[PDB]
From Swiss-Prot, chain C:
Protein name as it appears in the record: Probable proteasome subunit alpha type-7
Protein family per UniProt: Belongs to the peptidase T1A family.
Modifications made to the protein after synthesis: The alpha and beta forms are probably products of the same gene with different post-translational modifications.
Main localization (coarse): cytoplasm
Other information: Present with 12000 molecules/cell in log phase SD medium.
Sorted UniProt keywords: Acetylation, Cytoplasm, Nucleus, Proteasome
Source taxon at top rank: Eukaryota
Compartment(s) where it occurs, according to its Swiss-Prot or TrEMBL record: Cytoplasm; Nucleus
GO-annotated biological processes: proteasomal ubiquitin-independent protein catabolic process; proteasome-mediated ubiquitin-dependent protein catabolic process
UniProtKB/Swiss-Prot annotation, chain F:
One biological process term in Gene Ontology: proteasome-mediated ubiquitin-dependent protein catabolic process
Protein's name in the database: Proteasome subunit alpha type-6
Organism: Saccharomyces cerevisiae (strain ATCC 204508 / S288c)
UniProt record similarity statement: Belongs to the peptidase T1A family.
Record-listed Phosphoserine modification sites: 11
Gene that produces this protein: PRE5
Swiss-Prot record, chain G:
NCBIfam families with a match to the protein in the record: PRK03996.1
Coiled coil, from the record: none
UniProt miscellaneous comment: Present with 17100 molecules/cell in log phase SD medium.
Crosslinked positions (Glycyl lysine isopeptide (Lys-Gly) (interchain with G-Cter in ubiquitin)): 99, 198, 230
Protein name as annotated: Proteasome subunit alpha type-3
SMART domains: Proteasome_A_N
Taxonomic source organism: Saccharomyces cerevisiae (strain ATCC 204508 / S288c)
Assembly information from the UniProt record: The 26S proteasome consists of a 20S proteasome core and two 19S regulatory subunits. The 20S proteasome core is composed of 28 subunits that are arranged in four stacked rings, resulting in a barrel-shaped structure. The two end rings are each formed by seven alpha subunits, and the two central rings are each formed by seven beta subunits. The catalytic chamber with the active sites is on the inside of the barrel.
Annotated function: The proteasome degrades poly-ubiquitinated proteins in the cytoplasm and in the nucleus. It is essential for the regulated turnover of proteins and for the removal of misfolded proteins. The proteasome is a multicatalytic proteinase complex that is characterized by its ability to cleave peptides with Arg, Phe, Tyr, Leu, and Glu adjacent to the leaving group at neutral or slightly basic pH. It has an ATP-dependent proteolytic activity.
Subcellular location(s) of the protein: Cytoplasm; Nucleus
Swiss-Prot record, chain H:
GO cellular component, one term: proteasome core complex, alpha-subunit complex
Biological role stated in the UniProt entry: The proteasome degrades poly-ubiquitinated proteins in the cytoplasm and in the nucleus. It is essential for the regulated turnover of proteins and for the removal of misfolded proteins. The proteasome is a multicatalytic proteinase complex that is characterized by its ability to cleave peptides with Arg, Phe, Tyr, Leu, and Glu adjacent to the leaving group at neutral or slightly basic pH. It has an ATP-dependent proteolytic activity.
Gene symbol of the encoding locus: SCL1
Name used for this protein in its record: Proteasome subunit alpha type-1
Anything else known: Present with 15200 molecules/cell in log phase SD medium.
PROSITE patterns: PROTEASOME_ALPHA_1, PROTEASOME_ALPHA_2
Keywords attached to this entry: Acetylation, Cytoplasm, Isopeptide bond, Nucleus, Phosphoprotein, Proteasome, Ubl conjugation
Compartments reported by the entry: Cytoplasm; Nucleus
Pfam families in UniProt: Proteasome, Proteasome_A_N
Gene Ontology BP term (one): proteasomal ubiquitin-independent protein catabolic process
Domain of life: Eukaryota
Residues recorded with modification Phosphoserine: 227
SUPFAM superfamilies xrefs: N-terminal nucleophile aminohydrolases (Ntn hydrolases)
InterPro entries cross-referenced by the UniProt entry: Ntn_hydrolases_N, Proteasome_alpha, Proteasome_alpha-type, Proteasome_asu_N, Proteasome_sua/b, Proteasome_subunit_alpha6
Species name: Saccharomyces cerevisiae (strain ATCC 204508 / S288c)
């Protein structure tokens, strides 16, 4: 078998293949995650260079791992499918052996472990993908939002963004998001998520995707018209 | 058909005192109605102030004792010449025996 | 260019430079010889005394294969040991299947093919030793010498190492002056002399002499080391000739 | 030891070229000219027996090879590569078809299997592509007569007539003028000999030319009688004498 | 290019030396051993204020009597911790006893050099393994990706290591109490850290014979930080 | 230069640079001394520390009741090789009821180190070893190099500044060989030998490490206040 | 050793691109143009054969359009030999699904499987990727008529109308201009041929330089028919649309 | 320029490692020749023993592959012996599997296919040898089949290999142009050996002693090599006419 | 385990499964649910050798749930039954086969039809209006042959099921401790708590 060490250290103590995998994430479309008091919202960018697309059948950016957990990403699209599949398998495997669905932290730890394994295995390159994993633990009303990256490190976030122009939207969230009092309702949380994407997206038409996840496996994806109403309200308030 | 087990007879006895312990065993070794030896040692000093005997099928008995003595040696190498306590030795012997659960050492062991 | 960086690569000449570089390691090593006699063979080697702290007669260089074959080599000592280990496996499987001890020509090819195999791939390095070996079999006495390339021939006399030219010259004289042949006990004496004469190329450090022999009459066709009085007799003969 | 070349030796260059395949095609270009022509009632394949030495017996070296009783092959490029491909082609016709369906494969499917083998040498670890282009002529019940070309990439195309190797550019032009859809087998053989004479320098006769046909069934070449449904091989290699007879009426 | 297990002309493994450079870029971790216990402390170093700092796990339990702090590429440490936990529990299964801290450390270090062309590269993380056993008492070990481990009375690893180690040189003595050691870790962490030290961006832990390995709460650490400020202002 | 990328490549002068670079790692290592008489064999090792807070790296490893070694270079490689010796000594005992000969133990180490110098992918061992032991042919001392070369000696030293101790032993050859039935005097000669390799630093209680094996003396290691007698 | 000669096909550039994938896409950009157009009552697949000869046997030839099962077909752009390896794998995958669930494989599932295979060659194994781009035209009872594309990166996307191979930039602009949602198959046939006729590098578009196919519900009652056009049938539709 | 180190195509469509293996063939500086009689096939080769210390009996480039098949090699001895051992194994296996003696041309093809694999697979190098197989086949009669590092092979009426092959080749070509037959019209093999040696002397322009030559002869149901004394008798007969 | 029954009526599928778990001479439990929900509109009951039954049922459950997440779509009962059959057909030629018989009751939302499949441990699938495994069918098939009419309501199906259970309770030697009854229809799966 092909055993070649592709991910290796350099004189300055860097693993370039892992760092170049982050550059692939930087190229990817923007993804954002914001958690409220009783909800989490995942926002995603759709680049409008691709028109004449069939939006019914085109792979959606936000993927369900289980009925209570979701995964969005920035980076290579093909790579993301492999992580999602492995995660979905592990989710069912956990239910089978532990007789309880995965916690969001556990599912994140697994996905992050897979990414890490690909940074010190022979004959493989790292995943060019960073993920945002969000949801609610079984029988728990506390919102969860985690991030992973090609190196394999993971951590929890009150709010976070990844992908192209993520530096700008992270700047926005850092001043607008208050820890002492987060978005109390679903509306407030979605509004803040759409606002943060409007700093980068360009047009607020079919370029913004929103997915709301609530406790007890209550996940729903917003339509074009529903999102367009948020876009209208934000700009009308801005004209002042 | 080949029978991989045999019976070498003999009998062993362990008694625990207040600040001492004894492990006794007869020195006779047999097959069927014949005597093989009138003096064949059966109780062994295994180091770390532990004595052991594995009575029944002598070939398995010798193999087990030999492997436990070996385990004591490697316990010293791997853990900075630490003394193997009697309780730790007992647990180690369980794993030696259960390791051959589906082709057992045909012996009754006492330490 | 770049043809010499990887093993098993033909240069535009048709040469394998890696094998030629392995020869340089052989040429760097101590002198070792082999002498074919009437009913057997004699092996001898130069052991450089690097320090007084070396225990005399302990660091043995000559190795036995089976009970009838002797092996000596010059160059990287560990590579020679690896080759002898293989030779011992080859001889064992031959005797296992065919009952009779391995003939010397048969044994020579077993080593030859194994050394040659280490010139076929870039994943392995060629052997850094030239091995002189031989013994007595059903067809009589045989002496061989095997190079890093896997090339080997039969020899009347053989020599390798740093003092090979000096040795080769001395061996050529014996072949000319003794066409009817040389005896086993004579060959031991001559072997001692040739090592002493070949020591002029390694004249900085003093050395220790080591000799072995297989002979149909003197050793019943078995490999044995030359020890005690017979060794001292050969040293005295060698010391007398240089003076 | 171990084969530690588990990586591809053929890779895409910045321009999108697969270098080793292009270089393999260059090796085919240097090779001796061979051609194939399809008629209404048969197919003909031909090439020059470029003898490396006059002491060498050119009869022992067969450039035109039987793959199945109804399928033949000829090449241009590296002869040794062709020889092993013919061995593998003959075997795969049995293992992947005849041992399953109890009958020989149709021309297009055998070509597909040969093509697969050549593709794998273009992508698998530690190997170079085959340095040959094949012309495979054959017949089967449901597809009739057919002629296929197979390149180092593994790509294959069906032809009415074509040529490969040294003087293929000129030979293909010559065939375009002469070919029509109403050719009989003898007419195709005649055209094949005319086309091949242009690319040959030295001697031009039955001993220096190798030519075979896919035509009518040959019950005389079967080797046994008693089974009506077995009527014999459609592949036949023309003899030295049979070639010379047609060179007189040339 | 070049082999992964290649020696330099100086007689060092290139990849091992390069992994040590990655560890120097990592966040600071400090360990101090005393007769009353061993203290472990780390710099969390959150990349952004939105990152929930309590999810940063750079101090980790291996067993009840053994703790561990890390520095460098912390993702690499997960398989090392898993191996350590398995080794500790497995030894208890085979021998009905706690495993020696040195033996546990040795087991972790055996993985280090299992790389070639096994894993494709060395670990890019250093570990401070602290614990207690009946034979050798309270112990602190430093486990590198070279496969080497040294025992220490006190040790600092990470970006501010050489500056912290010099400070530990003067401050450490054989009669240190546990409370004195806790404050000393906080003192040195505060000195080498970029951002200002508080309960949210720094974490403490200890291992005692009685209570075993414990990660300190943010409320408990906050008091020790407040206790430190007062005693420094006292003179 | 161009021929030091891997162990499978000879240089134009017939040198193996990766093996020579592995040999260099030994010279960087701390000094250790070996010597013997007819009755006993002694190892003396100068342990090295990282700093004042750190412990002193252990230099001596026990292989069997009658055999052990001291290391200089990459310590993990010494652990791998000593583990191999432990297994080989142990195989000889279990199968043949026979204590492994010190000479044969050296032959096994030679052949193990050799395979790593001829194959692609792997690397040479980066450590030198001094093996002492008492077998059926009396006391023995071996010197192992990761090139594969093993040498039986009366006395020797390896590591940094080892030339000083090696010269001393070369002068004292006739004296210390005669120290029979006297372990303390043989150790004294070993401690005096390693002292010739010291600069600036001197032998302290937690710095020095001594080991001995003999006729009626199992392989035992002395550290701490047990070696204060010899300072 | 062998490391010296390894091209390292599965690595990132400093910019974060996969070298071999990018170069494979460059290869495909020189391949014959293939177009897929999806309508309300069917799907059209059109493709241009590359510089043919008069002596090429067209009626028995197949280089562009392949049948995966009764409901799904593909148009190829790139190395034909590479494509056939993947096609045979896809045919087997469809049959495995049919054996397991006793239902025809949904189009997307088949597409995802092939796309995952391509992905694997970019992340591990040290082999070169497949220099192939597919247009998938298929039907199932869930989503109805569907058009997909996949490329050497292993990334796939859904389309109403799409082109692959040569001159896709020019081709996509023309399709984007004249395509409408309420379009029918007969109109889509005309659009496909008109687009090829303008983007082609040849002097004139003829029957012998084309492969054509449709997937229609235009079959006796509720069922789907695949029609791979014959040379004479391509000649007739070229006259009907008014190109020749 | 790594396309010259391993067996992959150069831009010219060439395999440089194969071409350089051909050059290794002449490293020994030995010339061989093979001819066919009526009932026999004869192969001769130059024998050169430069060192006086060498045992001349062991210096040989002719091999007895099977009872019926003989093989002479042009190239270095390690590769020659590698090829010989393999050919012996293949010939033995063939007899076991298929119940009859392996023909000369079939063995040649087999060894040629093995050589072809080394030109296609990267990890295996070509052998720097040219193998000339000789026998009296039970179907085809006297046979000469020769293999090279490219994996090429063909039957021969007669052949020559070595540094001065062209001089020997043309000499043989000119003889067969006169006689107008595919063999040496001679009853006994002794006279066929005499023909072979005579025409090598004429071509190379050198005289030979008994120790300068090496001879192999193939007859029906056996192949054998001549001793020094057998060759001496052959040289005497040539000189006396 | 012992008795599992199934009946397909006009607009639903009803599965009845015994509550007893007997190991040797003792009834260890009298409230055991011998079924698993594979998907919202598909239910599988099971009976066979101890351990194998649950292990197999949960393994199938996990696989169907995995498919549902991956495709965001529910498989048809026919598709699930074919998957289950193949697993058992694969199993029968294994080292140690799954010794499990199953009934699969599902409501096809596409065709708006209830469907009942009977599959034994060999992988023998049959679609039926009513089915049973083990010795149950020897009593119940004759009753169902008489009374069953295809156009029955769910309430009529339960009455016909009560008549089956009464016969089993009268004539079978083993005390199976009653049955748990579950209905599968367009609205999903629900349990009849009083029976
Ligand atoms: Cl073959």
């Amino acid at each position: 078998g092909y055993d070649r060490a592709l991910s290796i250290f350099s004189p300055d103590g860097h693993i370039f293949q892992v760092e170049y995998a982050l550059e692939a994430v930087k190229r990817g479309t923007c993804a954002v995650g914001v958690k409220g008091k009783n909800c989490v919202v995942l926002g995603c960018e759709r680049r409008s260079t691709l028109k004449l697309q069939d939006t019914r059948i085109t792979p959606s950016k936000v993927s369900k791992i289980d009925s209570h957990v979701v995964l969005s990403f920035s980076g290579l699209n093909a790579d993301s499918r492999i992580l999602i599949e492995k995660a979905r398998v592990e989710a069912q495997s956990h239910r089978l052996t532990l007789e309880d669905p995965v916690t969001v932290e556990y599912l994140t730890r697994y996905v992050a472990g897979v990414q890490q394994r690909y940074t010190q295995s022979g004959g493989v390159r790292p995943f060019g993908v960073s993920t945002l994993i969000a949801g609610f633990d079984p029988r728990d009303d506390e919102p969860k939002l985690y991030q992973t990256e090609p190196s394999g490190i993971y951590s929890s976030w009150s709010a976070q963004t990844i992908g192209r122009n993520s530096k700008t939207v992270r700047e926005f969230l850092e001043k607008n998001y208050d820890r002492k009092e987060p978005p109390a309702t679903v509306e407030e949380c979605v509004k803040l998520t759409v606002r943060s994407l409007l700093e980068v997206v360009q047009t607020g038409a079919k370029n913004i995707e929103i997915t709301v996840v609530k406790p007890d496996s209550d996940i729903v994806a917003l339509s074009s018209e529903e999102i367009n109403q948020y876009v209208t309200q934000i700009e009308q308030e801005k004209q002042e | 058909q080949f029978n991989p087990y045999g019976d070498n007879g003999g009998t062993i006895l362990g008694i625990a005192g207040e600040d001492f312990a004894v492990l006794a065993g007869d020195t006779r070794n047999i097959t069927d109605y014949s005597i093989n030896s009138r003096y064949e040692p059966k109780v062994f000093d295994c180091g770390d102030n532990i004595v052991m005997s594995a009575n029944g099928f002598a070939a398995d008995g010798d193999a087990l004792v030999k492997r436990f003595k070996n385990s004591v040696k490697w316990y010293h190498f791997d853990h900075n010449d630490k003394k193997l306590s009697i309780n730790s030795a007992a647990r180690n012997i369980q794993h030696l025996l259960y390791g051959k659960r589906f082709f057992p050492y045909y012996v009754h062991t006492i330490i | 260019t770049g043809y010499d960086l990887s093993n098993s690569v033909f240069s535009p000449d048709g040469r394998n430079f890696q094998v030629e570089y392995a020869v340089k390691a052989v040429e760097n090593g101590t002198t070792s010889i082999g002498i074919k006699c009437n009913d057997g063979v004699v092996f001898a080697v130069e052991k450089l005394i690097t320090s007084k702290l070396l225990v005399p007669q302990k660091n043995v260089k000559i190795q036995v294969v089976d009970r009838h074959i002797g092996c000596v080599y010059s160059g990287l000592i560990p590579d020679g040991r690896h080759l002898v280990n293989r030779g011992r496996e080859e001889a064992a499987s031959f005797k296992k299947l065919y009952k009779t001890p391995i003939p010397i020509p048969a044994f020579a090819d077993r080593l030859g093919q194994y050394v040659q195999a280490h010139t076929l791939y870039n994943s392995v390095r060629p052997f850094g030793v030239s091995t002189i070996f031989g013994g007595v079999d059903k067809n009589g006495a045989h002496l061989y010498m095997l190079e890093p390339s896997g090339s080997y021939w039969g020899y009347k006399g053989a020599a390798t190492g740093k003092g090979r030219q000096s040795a080769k010259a001395e061996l050529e004289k014996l072949v000319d002056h003794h066409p009817e042949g040389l005896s086993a006990r004579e060959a031991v004496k001559q072997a001692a002399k040739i090592i002493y004469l070949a020591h002029e190329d390694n004249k900085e450090k003093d050395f220790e002499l080591e000799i072995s022999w297989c002979s149909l009459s003197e050793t019943n066709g078995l490999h044995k080391f030359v020890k005690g009085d017979l060794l001292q007799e050969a040293i005295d003969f060698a010391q007398k000739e240089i003076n | 030891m171990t084969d530690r070349y588990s990586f591809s030796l053929t890779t895409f260059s910045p321009s999108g070229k697969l270098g080793q395949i292009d270089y393999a095609l260059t090796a085919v270009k240097q090779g001796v000219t061979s051609l194939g022509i399809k008629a209404t009632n048969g197919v003909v394949i031909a090439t020059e027996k470029k003898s490396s030495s006059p002491l060498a017996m050119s009869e022992t070296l067969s450039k035109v090879s039987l793959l199945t009783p109804d399928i033949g092959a000829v090449y241009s490029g590296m002869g040794p590569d062709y020889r092993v491909l013919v061995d593998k082609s003959r075997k795969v016709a049995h293992t992947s078809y005849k041992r399953i369906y109890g009958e020989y494969p149709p021309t297009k499917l055998l070509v597909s299997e040969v093509a697969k083998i050549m593709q794998e040498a273009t992508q698998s670890g530690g190997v170079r592509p085959f340095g040959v282009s094949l012309l495979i002529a054959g017949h089967d019940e449901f597809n009739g007569f057919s002629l296929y070309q197979v390149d180092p990439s593994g790509s294959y195309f069906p032809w009415k007539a074509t040529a490969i190797g040294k003087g293929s550019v000129a030979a293909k032009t010559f065939l375009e003028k002469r070919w029509n859809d109403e050719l009989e087998l003898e007419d195709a053989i005649h055209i094949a000999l005319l086309t091949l004479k242009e690319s040959v320098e030295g001697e031009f006769n039955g001993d220096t030319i190798e030519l075979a046909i896919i035509g009518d069934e040959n019950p005389d070449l079967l080797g046994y009688t008693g089974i009506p449904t077995d009527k014999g091989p459609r592949f036949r290699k023309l003899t030295s004498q049979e070639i010379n007879d047609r060179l007189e009426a040339l | 290019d070049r082999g992964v297990s290649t020696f330099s002309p100086e007689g060092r493994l290139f990849q091992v030396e390069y992994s040590l450079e990655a560890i120097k870029l990592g966040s600071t971790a400090i360990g101090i051993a005393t007769k009353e216990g061993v203290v472990l402390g780390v710099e969390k170093r959150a990349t952004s204020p939105l990152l929930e700092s309590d999810s940063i796990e750079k101090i980790v339990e291996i067993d009840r009597h053994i703790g561990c702090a890390m520095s460098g590429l912390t993702a690499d440490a997960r398989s090392m911790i898993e191996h350590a936990r398995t080794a500790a529990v497995t030894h208890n299964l085979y021998y009905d006893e706690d495993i020696n801290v040195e033996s546990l450390t040795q087991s972790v270090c055996d993985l280090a050099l299992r790389f070639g062309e096994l894993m494709s590269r060395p670990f890019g993380v250093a570990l401070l393994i602290a614990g207690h056993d009946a034979d050798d008492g309270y112990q602190l070990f430093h486990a590198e990706p070279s496969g080497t481990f040294y025992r220490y009375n006190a040790k600092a690893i990470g970006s501010g290591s050489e500056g912290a180690q010099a400070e530990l040189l003067n401050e450490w003595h054989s009669s240190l109490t546990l409370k004195e050691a806790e404050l000393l870790v906080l003192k040195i962490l505060k000195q080498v850290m970029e951002e200002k030290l508080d309960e949210n961006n720094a974490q403490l832990s200890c291992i005692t014979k009685q209570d075993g390995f414990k990660i300190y709460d943010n409320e408990k650490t906050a008091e020790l930080i407040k206790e430190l400020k007062e005693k420094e202002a006292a003179e | 230069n161009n021929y030091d990328g891997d162990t499978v490549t000879f240089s134009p002068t017939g040198r193996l640079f990766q093996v020579e670079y592995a040999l260099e790692a030994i010279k960087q290592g701390s000094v250790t001394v070996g010597l013997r008489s007819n009755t006993h064999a002694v190892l003396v090792a100068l342990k090295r520390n990282a700093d004042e807070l750190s412990s002193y790296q252990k230099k001596i490893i026990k292989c069997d009741e009658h055999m052990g070694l001291s290391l200089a270079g990459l310590a993990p490689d010494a652990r791998v090789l000593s583990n191999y010796l432990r297994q080989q000594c142990n195989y000889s005992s279990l199968v043949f009821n026979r204590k492994l000969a010190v000479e044969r133990a050296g032959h096994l180490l030679c052949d193990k180190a050799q395979k790593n110098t001829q194959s692609y992918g792997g690397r040479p061992y980066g450590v030198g070893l001094l093996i002492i032991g008492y077998d059926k042919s009396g006391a023995h001392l071996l010197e192992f190099q990761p090139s594969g070369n093993v040498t039986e000696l009366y006395g020797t030293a390896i590591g940094a500044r080892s030339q000083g101790a090696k010269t001393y032993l070369e002068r004292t050859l006739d004296t210390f060989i005669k120290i029979d039935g006297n372990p303390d005097e043989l150790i004294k000669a070993g401690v005096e030998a390693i002292s010739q390799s010291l600069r600036d630093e001197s032998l302290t209680v937690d710095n020095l490490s001594i080991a001995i094996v003999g006729k009626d003396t199992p392989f035992t290691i002395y550290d701490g206040e047990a070696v204060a007698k010899y300072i | 050793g062998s490391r010296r000669y390894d091209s390292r096909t599965t690595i990132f550039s400093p910019e974060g691109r996969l070298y071999q994938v990018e170069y494979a896409l460059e290869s495909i950009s020189h391949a014959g143009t293939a177009i897929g157009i999806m309508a309300s009552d069917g799907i059209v697949l059109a493709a241009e054969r590359k510089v043919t000869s008069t002596l090429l046997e067209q009626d028995t030839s197949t280089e562009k359009l392949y049948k995966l099962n009764d409901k799904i077909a593909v148009a190829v752009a790139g190395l034909t030999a590479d494509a056939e390896i993947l096609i045979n794998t896809a045919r087997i995958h469809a049959q495995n699904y049919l054996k397991t669930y006793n239902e025809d494989i949904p189009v997307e599932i088949l597409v995802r499987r092939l796309s995952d295979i391509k992905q694997g060659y970019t992340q591990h194994g040290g082999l070169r990727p497949f220099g192939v781009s597919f247009i998938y035209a298929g039907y199932d009872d869930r989503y109805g008529y569907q058009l997909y594309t996949s490329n050497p990166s292993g990334n796939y996307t859904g389309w109403k109308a799409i082109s692959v191979g040569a001159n896709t930039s020019a081709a996509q602009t023309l399709l984007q201009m004249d395509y409408k949602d309420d379009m029918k198959v007969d109109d889509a046939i005309e659009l496909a041929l008109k687009t090829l006729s303008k983007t082609t590098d040849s002097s004139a578009l003829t029957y012998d330089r084309l492969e054509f196919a449709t997937i229609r519900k235009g079959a006796n009652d509720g069922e789907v028919y695949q029609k791979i056009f014959k040379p004479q049938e391509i000649k007739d539709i070229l006259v009907k649309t008014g190109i020749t | 320029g790594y396309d010259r180190h391993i067996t992959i195509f150069s831009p010219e469509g060439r395999l440089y490692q194969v071409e350089y293996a051909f050059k290794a063939t002449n490293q020994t500086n030995i010339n061989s020749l093979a001819v066919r009689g009526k009932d026999c096939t004869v192969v001769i080769s130059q024998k050169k023993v430069p060192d006086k210390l060498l045992d001349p009996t062991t210096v040989s480039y002719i091999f007895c592959i099977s009872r019926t098949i003989g093989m002479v090699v042009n190239g270095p001895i390690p590769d020659a012996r590698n090829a010989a051992l393999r050919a012996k194994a293949e010939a033995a296996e063939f007899r076991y599997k298929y119940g009859y003696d392996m023909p000369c041309d079939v063995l040649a093809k087999r060894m040629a296919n093995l050589s072809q694999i080394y030109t296609q697979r990267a990890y295996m190098r070509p052998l720097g040898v040219i193998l000339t197989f000789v026998s009296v086949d039970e179907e085809l009669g006297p046979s000469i089949y020769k293999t090279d590092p490219a994996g090429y092979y063909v039957g021969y009426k007669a052949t020559a290999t070595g540094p001065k092959q062209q001089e020997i080749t043309t000499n043989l070509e000119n003889h067969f142009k006169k006689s107008k037959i595919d063999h040496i019209n001679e009853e006994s093999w002794e006279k066929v050996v005499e023909f072979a040696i005579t025409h090598m002397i004429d071509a190379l322009g050198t005289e030979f002693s008994k120790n300068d030559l090496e001879v192999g002869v193939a007859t029906k149901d056996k192949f054998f090599t001549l001793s020094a004394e057998n060759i001496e008798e052959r040289l005497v007969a040539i000189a006396e006419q | 385990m012992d008795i599992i029954l199934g009946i397909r009526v006009q607009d639903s599928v009803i599965l009845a499964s015994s509550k007893a778990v007997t190991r040797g001479i003792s009834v260890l439990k009298d409230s055991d649910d011998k079924t698993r929900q594979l998907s919202p509109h598909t239910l599988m009951s099971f009976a066979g050798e101890a351990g194998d039954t649950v292990q197999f049922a949960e393994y199938i459950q996990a696989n169907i749930q995995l498919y549902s997440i991956r495709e965001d779509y529910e498989l048809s009962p026919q598709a699930v039954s074919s998957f289950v059959r193949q697993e058992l057909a694969k199993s029968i030629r294994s080292r140690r086969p799954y010794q499990v018989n199953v009934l699969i009751g599902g409501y096809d939302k596409k065709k708006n039809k209830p469907e009942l499949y009977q599959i034994d441990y060999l992988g023998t699938k049959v679609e039926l209006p009513y089915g049973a495994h083990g010795y149950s069918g020897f009593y119940t098939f004759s009753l169902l042959d008489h009374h069953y009419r295809p156009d029955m309501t769910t309430e009529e199906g339960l009455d016909l099921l009560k008549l089956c259970v009464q016969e089993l309770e009268k004539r079978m030697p083993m005390d199976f401790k009653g049955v748990i009854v579950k209905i599968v229809d367009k609205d999903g799966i629900r349990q009849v708590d009083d029976f």
